[PDB]
Amino acid sequence: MKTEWPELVGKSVEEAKKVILQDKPAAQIIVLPVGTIVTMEYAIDRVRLFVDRLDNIAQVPRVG
């Protein structure tokens, strides 16, 4: 079971969503700015995508 997507760093947020939904169709994807502080609960269904100001992925997406 794939739970991290390091190959998505530097891709567009669009491609990241498409790829993650192929691997994990029920994923609850939330897009947030990189460099923010976030809650520290672990939600197995969630994948946060942290984006830079250009809307490219700036951190390795993972489940949680």
Binding site: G35, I37, V38, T39, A43
Partner: protein, 281 residues
Amino acid sequence: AQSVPYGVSQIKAPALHSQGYTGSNVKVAVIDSGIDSSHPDLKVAGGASMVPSETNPFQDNNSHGTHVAGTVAALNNSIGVLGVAPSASLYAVKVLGADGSGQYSWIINGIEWAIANNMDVINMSLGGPSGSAALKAAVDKAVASGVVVVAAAGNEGTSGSSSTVGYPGKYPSVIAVGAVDSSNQRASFSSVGPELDVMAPGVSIQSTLPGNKYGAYNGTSMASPHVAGAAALILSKHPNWTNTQVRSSLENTTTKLGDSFYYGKGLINVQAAAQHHHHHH
């Protein structure tokens, strides 16, 4: 009937309750997504919002701050759950919006509010992978001012020999808390590193949720408020102990688990922490 979540028992909070200590008159800031003050199992004493588009700290549009708050201080009554420090004075310091995220300046403004309002304990069930000088300065200032500052270690799991503890937990002035389950096994998501200080229950933790609900959440976010709550119990039994002393009491009385890279000093034990003489069990 009220239920006592397993994690409250696991850290030996009931031993303090039976001695008569429940966190009365200790001010605890939950720096988070707000707290639903209408929940009948919470009493919110005050608070402030640093989130520009969500100005009411007593409205929690995410749910996370309310769950964290109930682990700290859900009321002792005949309903719901029981908090670690059910008489604590609970403050909703809203620095995260509905989506779970906040700007560094919002978190810092919340820490400054906590200092200015004489909070005894801050819980930050929150984090990010980078620090900033201004963030470090805010937590250091809160500690210099006498506040016990507790934060989630992070949910980054392992990464070889690298530390995966996030900020502000990773700062020396902050107690970074990892997560174990009811068997004292480290949760697989729990961050690791020499900055990990102690562990507390963070798997399937039942607590309060907005709109008079309850539910089981997972995370180092869930572990941190067991330790913030423990700090409030300790201070209610020893109101002149400094933050330095509260911190050492919790560190010096843990039940040691595995290697400190993965478990820090082990599971907190607030019964042992709140005695005068401290040792590990």
